Subunit: 118 residues, 8 copies
């Protein structure tokens, strides 16, 4: 079950179904899990044989801070689709958290998890 896991990537963005929400924006938190065979990379100790976590983080942050979407579903899909551009990846899961969602209730977190797989 070889995988790469990025957790708690924290980025200010402006996604939200309502206009009032894109005025100032809010905190988004991203998790990404990438399923990919890692044995070649442990054998070569060559970055080229694995998925560079650094570029994973950068691309996810750029997407979150980029053009606003109404749904976090759409954000999550764009990140997941980007990951799947690497044909070595068996599957990805992208969690888009909105811990500051303007909800009159008291809760810790709300998120969507987008899965892609081949």
């Amino acid at each position: 079950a070889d995988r790469i896991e990025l957790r708690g990537l924290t980025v200010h963005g402006r996604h939200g179904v309502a206009a009032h929400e894109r005025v100032a924006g809010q905190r988004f938190v991203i998790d990404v899990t990438v399923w990919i065979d890692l044995a070649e990379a442990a054998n070569s100790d060559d970055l080229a044989d694995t998925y560079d976590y650094v570029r994973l983080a950068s691309r996810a942050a750029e997407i979150v801070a980029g053009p606003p979407r109404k749904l976090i579903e759409t954000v999550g899909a764009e990140i997941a689709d980007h990951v799947m551009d690497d044909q070595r990846v068996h599957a990805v899961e992208v969690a888009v958290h909105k811990p500051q969602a303007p909800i009159p209730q008291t809760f810790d977190d709300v998120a969507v998890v987008i899965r892609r797989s081949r």
Copy 2:
């Protein structure tokens, strides 16, 4: 494995087997995981193509805040059955936590998890 995840929804309520528990009630904490295909919603960026987290939290809180049940089994079944009314939903899991359960032992949490699926 697309899903929506609500975590730590915190609502005061009156559930419990013994009478003394429904004098002042206590803190309940609710998690809901909804398995649903979110591909269209990411395609459309339209709220109507997904399950609105806002109403997921509202309804969960209403039920917890509502008529008292003896068991937390009952509460989670009523939230889960509500979520399954949306025929887009493949399955649901509702965790009802009772972290202030009056037991003399020391413990972080106790909960039931009710699972429903097609």
Copy 3:
């Protein structure tokens, strides 16, 4: 230095300087520290000899949930003045936290602390 400490009182409200902050509102988190002599309540074991935390928490919640102010300073001052109406209180400090304040930076918390004394 005898005192009563309420920590983490969490209430949804609409305080804020600009109009966007008021549409949906956000989570406010309140602390109250009440300096009062507690020797007599220890000797009588009688609630009227101390400051009842029960009414403290509900009145604080009422003020925070209520009509919005522009500044959290003035929310804090309303809670502090309420606590000072009790002649037994030597001093009080009210922390009004805005941990979801809509600013672009990544930060854990922002708050004001209002102090009153006789």
Copy 4:
């Protein structure tokens, strides 16, 4: 996936392979997950229709606090087999944690998970 989850049951105990660990004991932390069908309990709202968490916690704590064993494996098996005496139980997992394991390394936790099932 219907289940009951007890988390963080904290009990002083005296298990350990070495004599030094029987002298004063240490903190043990227990998790129990019980897979059981809860639909009838949700339908009757009758505690007899479910596994009572109160007695789950009490018997788990009695065993942890009980006769010392060398291995946490043994402790976890005794708790799991106890839970399985309830024929409605499909399976159980008991995790016995020894967070204070006297090892020179720095670490958050060490534990065993014992699984029983039919």
Copy 5:
């Protein structure tokens, strides 16, 4: 400022003003801070020249677990007066926390801090 600090001492008890709080009781969390000069003990490395935390924790646990008081004020004063029976002590602060207090608001903690000193 030399001091001994005990934090998070967790004890089940049955304190409280109203009848319902005593059927089952609830979790109490105690902190103690003891101001005492520690230079002698550093000089001798002899437990007799300091305040033994071991007796501090069992005696404070004993008091909390003991016959119920109506107020947590009264519990903290018995613990503080116990510590002050050691003439070496300059002062003490006892925080009695009632994190599961049966009030309808959502809050992290409520506590009283009893101070005594010569």
Copy 6:
């Protein structure tokens, strides 16, 4: 004791004595505490009568993100001097934390606090 408290402002920077620290930089965490009279602000409910947290966070972040210093002391002084620019301010304390400091020991945090007063 009226004050404004900003906690955990998190900013990547390159501060550090030696050259290796400057290649990639590391996470810095800033707290600011501003002692200022808030009574007029509560009476007017007018942002001009207080110290705006928004400008405080953005400026503090700019300073931490900017050209590196050798010492976190100097970063802290630069933030404290900025705040003291406001003649209404009685005093300020700035904490600059370096929780990822590249030292071989295992530890939670290392920081400097800088105070200024008038």
Copy 7:
């Protein structure tokens, strides 16, 4: 689903693809999960019939503090292969976390998980 779990093993090391990273090194955090049948060990209460956690943690820490590798992939592979040396083991997963990875984004953790099995 009998298993042994080690969590949060914290060890300073010098893995990294760039030279600047091996100059002073950084904190790594390791998790190990060992699937193995534990019924025999519960039967006998004899350490020889299970996998000793103590040498699990030792060997893992030695490997992490050992010869630096470019990739954390390689570190996990080495620990995983060591575990599989015991013919009783059905499978293992080793999580190698780099929570202080020098990337300019703000995130909680990044890790790789290596699995070996039958």
Copy 8:
């Protein structure tokens, strides 16, 4: 109030009054607070003008990991005396935490705090 704060320095050691505590040892956790004027440092940006945190953590660790004392008071005084050897230091507080202290109550932390000044 200018100061340097080190928090959570974690070191295995063998301190303890009773014989059993010395066979395997246990985790100790140290905090140090150093009061020292930091203005000159901020002026020169030169490490020589301040108290170097990395030698502070190295020497504190060595002390904790060295030959055992009976009391944590004497460990803390040894660290404090070392810090006062720098004649620029005004005052120091050292907290020695024994979070795994082998008492039978359930608690989060026990510690002593040693202060020294001029």
